[PDB]
Design an enzyme around this catalytic site. Structure first.
Site, short mmCIF file in Angstrom:
data_model
loop_
_atom_site.label_atom_id
_atom_site.label_comp_id
_atom_site.label_asym_id
_atom_site.label_seq_id
_atom_site.Cartn_x
_atom_site.Cartn_y
_atom_site.Cartn_z
N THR A 128 29.92 107.43 86.22
CA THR A 128 30.03 106.33 87.17
C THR A 128 30.18 106.73 88.60
O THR A 128 29.42 106.23 89.47
CB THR A 128 31.18 105.44 86.73
OG1 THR A 128 30.91 105.02 85.37
CG2 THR A 128 31.38 104.25 87.70
N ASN A 130 33.63 112.47 87.58
CA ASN A 130 34.75 111.51 87.56
C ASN A 130 36.11 112.24 87.67
O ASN A 130 37.07 111.64 88.16
CB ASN A 130 34.70 110.75 86.22
CG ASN A 130 33.66 109.66 86.20
OD1 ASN A 130 33.03 109.34 87.22
ND2 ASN A 130 33.44 109.08 85.01
N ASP A 154 24.31 102.13 86.93
CA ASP A 154 24.67 103.47 87.31
C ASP A 154 24.10 104.50 86.35
O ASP A 154 23.76 105.60 86.80
CB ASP A 154 26.16 103.65 87.57
CG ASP A 154 27.03 103.24 86.36
OD1 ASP A 154 26.48 102.65 85.39
OD2 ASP A 154 28.27 103.57 86.39
C1 LIG Z 1 32.32 105.25 93.01
C2 LIG Z 1 31.71 104.36 94.03
N1 LIG Z 1 31.01 104.77 95.15
N2 LIG Z 1 30.68 103.75 95.89
N3 LIG Z 1 31.18 102.66 95.24
C3 LIG Z 1 31.11 101.37 95.74
C4 LIG Z 1 30.00 100.63 95.07
C5 LIG Z 1 28.65 101.04 95.36
C6 LIG Z 1 27.63 100.24 94.82
C7 LIG Z 1 26.25 100.55 95.21
F1 LIG Z 1 25.63 99.73 96.05
F2 LIG Z 1 26.12 101.74 95.72
F3 LIG Z 1 25.36 100.44 94.22
C8 LIG Z 1 27.86 99.21 94.04
C9 LIG Z 1 29.18 98.83 93.75
C10 LIG Z 1 30.27 99.56 94.31
C11 LIG Z 1 31.65 99.06 93.98
C12 LIG Z 1 32.15 99.71 92.71
C13 LIG Z 1 33.58 99.24 92.35
O1 LIG Z 1 34.02 98.22 92.72
N4 LIG Z 1 34.36 100.04 91.57
C14 LIG Z 1 35.88 99.90 91.50
C15 LIG Z 1 36.17 100.17 89.97
N5 LIG Z 1 35.64 101.58 89.65
C16 LIG Z 1 36.29 102.24 88.58
C17 LIG Z 1 35.56 102.36 87.33
C18 LIG Z 1 36.26 102.78 86.18
C19 LIG Z 1 37.71 103.12 86.28
S1 LIG Z 1 38.56 103.56 84.85
N6 LIG Z 1 37.91 105.03 84.43
O2 LIG Z 1 39.96 103.81 85.29
O3 LIG Z 1 38.12 102.55 83.81
C20 LIG Z 1 38.43 103.07 87.57
C21 LIG Z 1 37.72 102.64 88.70
F4 LIG Z 1 38.35 102.61 89.92
C22 LIG Z 1 34.11 101.60 89.76
C23 LIG Z 1 33.87 101.38 91.19
N7 LIG Z 1 31.82 103.02 94.04
CA LIG Z 2 29.52 103.90 84.80
CL LIG Z 3 33.31 114.65 84.96
ZN LIG Z 4 31.39 104.80 80.77
#
Ligand SMILES: Cc1nnn(Cc2cc(C(F)(F)F)ccc2CCC(=O)N2CCN(c3ccc(S(N)(=O)=O)cc3F)CC2)n1
Ligand SMILES: [Ca+2]
Ligand SMILES: [Cl-]
Ligand SMILES: [Zn+2]
Ligand SMILES: *[C@@H]1O[C@H](CO)[C@@H](O[C@@H]2O[C@H](CO)[C@@H](O[C@@H]3O[C@H](CO[C@H]4O[C@H](CO)[C@@H](O)[C@H](O[C@H]5O[C@H](CO)[C@@H](O)[C@H](O)[C@@H]5O[C@H]5O[C@H](CO)[C@@H](O)[C@H](O)[C@@H]5O)[C@@H]4O)[C@@H](O)[C@H](O[C@H]4O[C@H](CO)[C@@H](O)[C@H](O)[C@@H]4O[C@H]4O[C@H](CO)[C@@H](O)[C@H](O)[C@@H]4O)[C@@H]3O)[C@H](O)[C@H]2NC(C)=O)[C@H](O)[C@H]1NC(C)=O
Ligand SMILES: [Ca+2]
Ligand code: NA
Ligand code: NA
Length: 805
Positions: free
Chosen positions: A159, A180, A308
């Protein structure tokens, strides 16, 4: 500290960030534990849910409600997305026929079509066909707009690396989010999904699209959403920002969904439980499009629906354990799962040795489901090495498998049935792209492309100049109706010399020999014409490559091939030849086995020598134009010129000789002729960019002959294979590779077998884009074709993947 006694009154989902200790009301305040005391009450309303019903139509506004169905909701911009349908007799967007959006149809005060990026986690490319019956809104975006059958993610297919590649146009080695999980040895700090280190800006390099926009005067919605904010509230928030006054309203927005990835990890990519998350995502797209339709924006906004990475079947039982290979397993740290990264547990143990770890992990078990590499040996197409956060030792894990350090890591952590992270050419890892709107084309299918290209297109959609990135700007112009970017070819920096005959044979003291003294005015004028370029149109089909840096080199012509010969590196930068479907393979004749011939066009001082190879017990030589494919016994002597020789480890000669003797003619047969350009690559600092002379780490012993780290070939033919490669009227077709030049075949576990059993498998692993070779050589190919320049840029980004459909 946060002084959480401020209020969110009139600030819900504010766009500007407020600094500690003042409390926050933005879509990220939850993830920092920093929201004002009344954020839930004011900003996360849920009363009466997300849909208007007949009995709410015309209601007295109750500010407590999640969304409104009162008469004033349209001017407040906070109606439930289905308000006009339930209350005003309108149709859902998905029920309307599609009609071409030839020009933007935007409300007054709109300066440009806004861009909405609707990002879906773990959305595997094949869901678009396989789930189409339960995703009508997504199917309408796809069929009416512009879609690719799939979009290729970056490696690792996780991701954080991929969302930030989408946002920046950069490979993860350049933007810095290389997994990650990461350790940075200069910071001495660890990045993880859980917790606070990841919010430190020092990890995040490049320039993401929301910063590019803001720097150039284009306002941006905040892209990130805290997980506890329901999707319906994210959509409502976007729609409310789109009702702001002109001077306050953003032009670019992102939605993010954690589905279908969340359920795919639990159920596998096609678990029967996966139908409902696809239905729910489709319903969310329908709320957005209904909502845009209410705002009269449904033929004004460009929408990108993009994922993604995909999802593969992976279960706990398909795990390899390093404890089954290594004795010293407690002395290493492993980043585990669908890729492995290994480094020393302690920097104070100087009995840790990468060479011994690699050897202990190499071809040790018959069915072994991972392969170890030093990072500089990974396929160059992964672009996964030039960053101090990428550990030197890497394990490439087979699809469907995991690696772990010890069994106790897997049962003290079966639950899961899906995972992702594997090699980005694996079919299960591919994801989706659809673009719909006035700037995208209508009912158009485009070929698959890489996600590194999208940032440039998003910048074109918003009228922004992209920050320097790894897309090839113009390669996706065929997705767009307008806003195309019309690049010009780079200027050639070094012009070639065209040497004639300038040296006598006795001036050379190279220690070479050849039995060539076999001694006609008819045939003599002929061979002079060949040396001046008379067959050059047959062998150089797309013009000579341009050299984009300062250097000294010579063009050399021959009956069967043309080359650009570097006086600095003592060998060709490129060698170009065409092999028709009718061509015949021949042997190297007995009396010519060890023949190397001085080239009387090139000084002794700018030539290789045979004595160096005789004395270097590790190093042998090969040729770039293959002697097996000579057009006649007499032409074959040109193939033994010292200016066609290149240094090759004997183990690499096995691979190269099989490519040249067997595979080229196979390709010519299958593709109706091929044009081949082959050459060396030097990338000793593994930065994906051509080395200068003072970066070369290895020479043929006792000489100034540099040793390549890789050999490439670009193999071009007519896309319409009913026309031969040398008489092609229309689009071209290409495949290329960048083979690592290694002194063993330890990468190929079956290399004791005949080459027919392993060499082509190796070459497929090291498939490449022409653009990858351009970066590694400073050369610019396809300079003189019939074809539009954007079409040629698309051809240069093509990757031949060797996956089925
Ligand atoms: C990384 C990243 N880089 N840029 N962006 C910004 C970006 C870029 C683009 C796009 F336009 F580029 F497509 C499209 C959307 C976003 C927003 C992504 C977003 O809201 N999230 C917050 C939650 N995240 C997350 C996932 C899983 C876990 S877990 N493992 O604890 O379950 C903890 C997390 F915090 C995923 C990212 N995100
Ligand atoms: Ca993902
Ligand atoms: Cl990794
Ligand atoms: Zn996954
Ligand atoms: C994919 O696209 C990208 C973007 O176009 C390409 O990357 C560019 O490649 C260029 C060459 O490798 C490079 O240009 C160099 O910039 C140096 C200045 O660096 C800073 O400024 C930029 C611009 O704002 C910035 O983006 C940089 O960001 C990097 O570093 C921080 C961490 O510090 C990270 O957060 C970020 O993720 C990024 O890291 C990545 O790049 C660096 C290298 O810059 C790597 O080390 C990382 O592993 C990671 O991949 C910086 O904040 C500048 O100093 C360079 O100039 C040197 O070389 C020239 C030769 O012309 C010479 O004149 C000078 O002498 C100088 O050398 C001196 O320093 C040496 C090191 O200490 C020393 O040995 C010497 O003796 C000298 O003292 C150079 O111009 C540009 O930075 C990147 N940009 C990015 C964003 O990555 C990439 O090549 C493309 N990939 C492919 C395959 O095509
Ligand atoms: Ca380099
Ligand atoms: Na030798
Ligand atoms: Na082997």
């Amino acid at each position: 500290w946060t002084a959480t006694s401020g209020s969110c009154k009139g600030r819900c989902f504010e766009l500007q960030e407020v600094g500690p200790p003042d409390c926050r009301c933005d879509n990220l305040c939850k993830s920092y534990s920093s929201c004002c005391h009344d954020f839930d009450e004011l900003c996360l309303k849920t009363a009466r849910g997300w849909e208007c019903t007949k009995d709410r139509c015309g209601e007295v506004r109750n500010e407590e409600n999640a969304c409104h169905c009162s008469e004033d909701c349209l001017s407040r911009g906070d109606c439930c997305t289905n308000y006009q349908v339930v209350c005003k007799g309108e149709s859902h967007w998905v029920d309307d026929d599609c009609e071409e959006i030839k020009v933007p149809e935007c409300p007054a005060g709109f300066v440009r079509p806004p861009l909405i990026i609707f990002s879906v986690d773990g959305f595997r490319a094949s869901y678009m066909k396989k789930g189409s019956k339960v995703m009508p809104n997504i199917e309408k975006l796809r069929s009416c707009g512009t879609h690719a059958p799939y979009m290729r993610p970056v490696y690792p297919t996780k991701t954080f690396p991929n969302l930030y590649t989408l946002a920046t146009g950069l490979y993860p080695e350049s933007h810095g989010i290389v997994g990650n999980s990461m350790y940075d040895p200069v910071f001495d700090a660890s990045f993880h999904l859980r917790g606070r280190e990841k919010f430190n800006h020092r990890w995040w390099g490049g320039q993401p699209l929301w910063i590019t926009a803001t720097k150039q005067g284009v306002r941006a919605g905040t892209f990130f959403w805290s997980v506890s904010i329901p999707h319906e509230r994210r959509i409502l928030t976007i729609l409310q920002w789109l009702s702001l006054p002109d001077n306050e309203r953003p032009s670019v927005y992102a939605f993010y969904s954690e589905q279908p990835d969340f359920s795919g990890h639990k159920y596998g990519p096609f678990g029967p439980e996966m139908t409902n998350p696809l239905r729910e995502i489709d319903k969310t797209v329908g709320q957005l499009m209904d909502g845009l339709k209410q705002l009269r924006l449904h033929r004004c906004v460009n929408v990108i629906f993009v994922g993604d990475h995909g999802m593969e079947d992976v279960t706990c039982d398909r795990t390899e354990f390093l404890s089954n290979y290594l004795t010293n397993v407690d002395d290493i740290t492993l980043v585990p799962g669908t890729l492995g990264r290994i480094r020393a547990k302690s920097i104070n143990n100087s009995k840790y040795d990468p060479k011994t770890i690699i050897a202990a992990l190499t071809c040790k078990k018959p069915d072994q489901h991972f392969k170890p590499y030093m990072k500089q040996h990974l396929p160059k197409r992964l672009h996964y090495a030039n960053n101090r956060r990428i550990e030197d030792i890497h394990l490439l894990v087979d699809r469907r498998w995991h690696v772990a350090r010890k069994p106790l890591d897997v049962y003290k952590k079966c639950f899961f049935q899906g995972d992702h992270g594997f090699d980005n050419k694996v079919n299960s890892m591919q994801t989706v792209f659809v673009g719909y709107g006035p700037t995208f084309k209508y009912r158009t299918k485009v070929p698959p492309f890489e996600n590194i290209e999208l940032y440039n297109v998003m910048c074109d959609l918003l009228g922004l100049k992209p920050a320097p990135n790894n897309g090839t700007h113009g390669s996706l112009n065929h997705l767009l109706r307008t806003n195309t970017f019309r690049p010009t070819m780079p200027d050639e920096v070094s012009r070639p010399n065209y040497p004639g005959i300038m040296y006598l044979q006795s001036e050379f003291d190279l220690g070479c020999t050849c039995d060539d003294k076999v001694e006609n005015k008819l045939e003599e004028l002929n061979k002079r014409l060949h040396t001046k370029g008379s067959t050059k149109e047959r062998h150089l089909l797309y013009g000579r490559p341009a050299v984009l840096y300062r250097t000294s080199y010579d063009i050399l012509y021959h009956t069967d091939f043309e080359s650009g010969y570097s006086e600095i590196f003592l060998m060709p930068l490129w060698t170009s030849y065409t092999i028709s479907k009718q061509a015949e393979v021949s042997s190297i004749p007995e009396h010519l086995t060890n023949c190397v011939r001085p080239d009387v066009r090139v000084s002794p001082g700018f030539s290789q020598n045979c004595l160096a190879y005789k004395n270097d017990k590790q190093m042998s030589y090969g040729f770039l134009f293959p002697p097996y494919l000579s057009s006649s016994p007499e032409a074959k002597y040109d193939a033994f010129l010292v200016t066609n020789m290149v240094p090759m480890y004997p183990a690499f000669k096995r691979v190269w000789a099989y490519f040249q003797r067997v595979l080229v003619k196979k390709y010519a047969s299958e593709r109706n002729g091929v044009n081949v350009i082959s050459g060396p690559i030097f990338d000793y600092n593994y930065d994906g960019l051509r080395d200068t002379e003072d970066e070369i780490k290895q020479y043929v012993e006792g000489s100034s002959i540099p040793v390549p780290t890789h050999y490439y070939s670009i193999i071009t033919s007519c896309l319409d294979f009913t026309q031969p490669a040398d008489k092609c009227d229309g689009p071209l077709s290409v495949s290329s590779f960048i083979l690592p030049h290694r002194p063993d075949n330890d990468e190929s576990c079956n290399s004791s077998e005949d080459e027919s059993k392993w060499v082509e498998e190796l070459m497929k692993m090291h498939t490449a884009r022409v653009r990858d070779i351009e970066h590694l050589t400073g050369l610019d190919f396809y300079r003189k074709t019939s074809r539009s320049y954007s079409e040629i840029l698309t051809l240069k980004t093509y990757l031949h993947t060797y996956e089925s459909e």
